Design a protein around this nucleic acid. Structure first.
Ligand SMILES: NC(=O)OC[C@@H](O)C[C@H](NC(=O)[C@H]1NCCC[C@H]1O)C(=O)N[C@@H](Cc1c[nH]cn1)C(=O)N[C@H](C(=O)O)[C@H](O)c1c[nH]c(Cl)n1
Ligand SMILES: [K+]
Ligand SMILES: [K+]
Ligand SMILES: [K+]
Ligand SMILES: [K+]
Ligand SMILES: [K+]
Ligand SMILES: [Mg+2]
Ligand SMILES: [Mg+2]
Ligand SMILES: [Mg+2]
Ligand SMILES: [Mg+2]
Ligand SMILES: [Mg+2]
Ligand SMILES: [Mg+2]
Ligand SMILES: [Mg+2]
Ligand SMILES: [Mg+2]
Ligand SMILES: [Mg+2]
Ligand SMILES: [Mg+2]
Ligand SMILES: [Mg+2]
Ligand SMILES: [Mg+2]
Lengths: 101, 117, 102, 64
RNA sequence: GCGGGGUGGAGCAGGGUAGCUCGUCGGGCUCAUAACCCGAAGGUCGUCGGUUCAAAUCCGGCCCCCGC
RNA sequence: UUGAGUCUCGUAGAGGGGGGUAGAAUUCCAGGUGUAGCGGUGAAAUGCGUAGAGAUCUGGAGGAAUACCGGUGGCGAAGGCGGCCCCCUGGACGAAGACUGACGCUCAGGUGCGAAAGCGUGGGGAGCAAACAGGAUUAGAUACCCUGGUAGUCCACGCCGUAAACGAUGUCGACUUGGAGGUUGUGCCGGCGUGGCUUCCGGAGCUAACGCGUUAAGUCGACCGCCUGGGGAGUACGGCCGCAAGGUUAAAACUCAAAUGAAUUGACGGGGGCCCGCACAAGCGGUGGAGCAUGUGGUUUAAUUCGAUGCAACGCGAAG
RNA sequence: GGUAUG
């Protein structure tokens, strides 16, 4: 003004991602959607779940110059926004399909 | 057509518009291009970028004459003074002498009245 | 193309704009005549005139004062004008007679 | 402001020299003052206020 | 007599594919008002059909209506 | 002979009048090259351009003004005066003397000079530009803005006689602490003096205060001009002056109880400077659309009890 | 950044 690691992969970037996906404090609901999405992603790509997630972020990450914290924050926000718009049936698959694309 | 080794880039940089004209050394017109003719209209013309584009299209007009040397002759207080010559050098002409024309009366005629705005 | 010129000559066809003189329930003869003059001009120079009367606060309770002003304009601008529209109700606080060149 | 690019000089360095040649010579300031007519009383008034400012800054530099 | 046109209340755009202006109403903005901004309601488009895949559209009749 | 003049020698200066001339720039004309824009604004349009513009280059024509130097620099009674050169010409200042011997100061009336606009006659006319024409803007736009554009601006001669013609400060003389500069002489040995003009600050003193302050608005003397509440009014009438526009001299009735100056405290400013608050920005979730709850306005009613109304009334007094 | 009016 005028004046925590995600517990399944050790990436805080995914802990942030859970938080952006989360609605109404429902953090466990959010966690399941994202993990389900990452395993789905891995089965239809074939990496460790972060590499595919990070390649998916690289395509969205915007370059006034965006600095790298806002960059990944924007990317993840745009991914989640893009995912929620779609007509795939669950958010897990919406997220998996959006990440794939 | 004729080939010309060395040319002259006359940059009429007014406040509202930029005219870039490549001539021979004797001031015979080879090609010209303006910010107004570069898909900028109104006060879009009076930016450095619109002059930059006008320079590039002027360079493209005089590709056939096979010019590599240009002497620059910038004239006026226009926003696109330096952006033209920068973009002319980017086209790949070796800029020799860089020179400010700009007609100054030594007194001369009475100017129009000040705009009350 | 200088084609354009065709339009410039085309554009020497013409155009009517409507010009809006706002009267108030109690404007005085002097200013009436000034605004009346403005309209004569407007009209004679080939233009329409959205004449508006604009009741303010309680004045809305004597709308009939207003209507008399309009009716005076109609009756003065008689040989110059025909009265596209007259009002009867007082929507908002306004009465918006539109006159046109006879 | 005539700037021949000397034996083996970059453009960016050469452009800095040209812009500086114009800045010293007084071309953009000169064109702008000659854009609209200033009548002598305005000219003289402007020249007085500058002289007052210049001098008053020296008396602010002094007494300090 | 000869034509034009009949299009939301207003008037004016618009071979099929109806707006635009101002009313008209409500909202927003403001301390308040005008200005400004947004939304909605208003036509079936003179009528009668034929005719065109299309009827504001095309073609005629008719109602016209004023200009003349 | 100390005031006031004259002479000798030298100095600085946009002082004045006349003539000539230089370079830059705008416009225009004629060509060459060239090709679709140019110009303009807050945004546009009018306008200009394929009968070739704008741009660029060569040449020509014409008028007006003199960049830099340039300076709270200079000169002039004031108005004003700015390229360079010559001719004619006015004033100021310094150094030493020599000379005249109060020849002085001020000045009603008078006489002349007197920015710009304006007027008459005849020229001239690039640029600029009242009026005007068109294009915009707007509630309107007789404007501000845009494109054009006539008088005029320029010259000669004559007229006008006014300006915030201001230092809003009459002219002349004498006297009265200082400081820092500028400009222009001059003596003496960069320094040390000494004259003229001039800028800024400030002491006593003065002043309502602001301020002025050896260039006084201080302390005095000479002479002139002028003021006597505001508006009416620098108007009417009369005279004088002018071709005219108008100028100059200059009231009264009446009406008002004020008008006014400087400064103080606020407040305010589409004045400047520095800060803060979920004020904005960055976010996340809403309201505004739907249904319903609730309050209010309105309307209705026999009554729809009274109160709360921008922020700071409206699930508020009412916790039923 | 500039619109007026109580
Ligand atoms: N017309 C009416 O009755 O009302 C409208 C008027 O109030 C508009 C208002 N106008 C202005 O301030 C004038 N200032 C002087 C130059 C002209 C004009 O600009 C205005 O808002 N301007 C805008 C431009 C504009 C005009 N119409 C719509 N918009 C503007 O930018 N004004 C500037 C400002 O307010 O600082 C400035 O005055 C300006 C720049 N350029 C121009 Cl033109 N004007
Ligand atoms: K006498
Ligand atoms: K003229
Ligand atoms: K005091
Ligand atoms: K008289
Ligand atoms: K009296
Ligand atoms: Mg002088
Ligand atoms: Mg003067
Ligand atoms: Mg005297
Ligand atoms: Mg004159
Ligand atoms: Mg004359
Ligand atoms: Mg002009
Ligand atoms: Mg003009
Ligand atoms: Mg006087
Ligand atoms: Mg006086
Ligand atoms: Mg002082
Ligand atoms: Mg006094
Ligand atoms: Mg008089």
């Amino acid at each position: 003004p005028r004046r925590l690691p995600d517990p399944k992969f050790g990436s805080e970037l995914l802990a942030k991602f859970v938080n952006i996906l989360m609605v109404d404090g429902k953090k466990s609901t959010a966690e399941s959607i994202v993990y389900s999405a990452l395993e789905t992603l891995a089965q239809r790509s074939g990496k460790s779940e972060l590499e595919a997630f990070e390649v998916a972020l690289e395509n969205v990450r915007p370059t006034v110059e965006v600095r790298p914290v806002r960059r990944n924050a924007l990317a993840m926000r745009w991914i989640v926004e893009a995912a929620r718009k779609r007509g795939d049936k669950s958010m897990a698959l919406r997220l998996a399909n959006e990440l794939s694309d | 057509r004729k080939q010309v080794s060395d040319g002259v880039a006359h940059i009429h940089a007014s406040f509202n518009n930029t005219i870039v004209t490549i001539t021979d050394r004797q001031g015979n017109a080879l090609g010209w291009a303006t910010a107004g003719g570069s898909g900028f209209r109104g006060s879009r013309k009076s930016t450095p970028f619109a002059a930059q584009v006008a320079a590039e299209r002027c360079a493209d007009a005089v590709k056939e004459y096979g010019i590599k040397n240009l002497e620059v002759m910038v004239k006026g207080p226009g926003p696109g003074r330096e952006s033209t010559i920068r973009a002319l050098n980017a086209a790949g002409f070796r800029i020799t002498n860089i020179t400010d024309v700009t007609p100054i009366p030594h007194x001369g005629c009475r100017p129009p009245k000040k705009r009350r705005v | 193309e200088k084609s354009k010129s065709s339009k410039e000559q085309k554009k020497k066809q013409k155009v009517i704009q409507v010009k809006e003189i706002k009267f108030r329930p109690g404007t005085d003869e002097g200013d009436y005549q000034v605004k009346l003059r403005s309209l004569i001009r407007f009209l004679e120079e080939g233009d329409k005139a959205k004449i508006t009367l604009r009741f303010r606060g309680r004045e809305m309770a004597h709308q009939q004062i207003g209507m008399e002003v309009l009716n005076r304009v109609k009756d003065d601008l008689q040989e110059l004008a025909v009265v596209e529209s007259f009002p009867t109700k007082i929507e908002g606080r306004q009465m918006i007679m539109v006159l046109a060149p006879k | 402001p005539v700037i021949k690019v000397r034996e083996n000089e970059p453009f960016d360095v050469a452009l800095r020299r040209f812009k500086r040649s114009c800045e010293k010579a007084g071309v953009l300031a000169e064109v702008r003052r000659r854009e609209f007519y200033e009548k002598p009383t305005t000219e003289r008034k402007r020249a007085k206020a500058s002289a007052v400012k210049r001098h008053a800054k020296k008396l602010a530099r002094e007494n300090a």
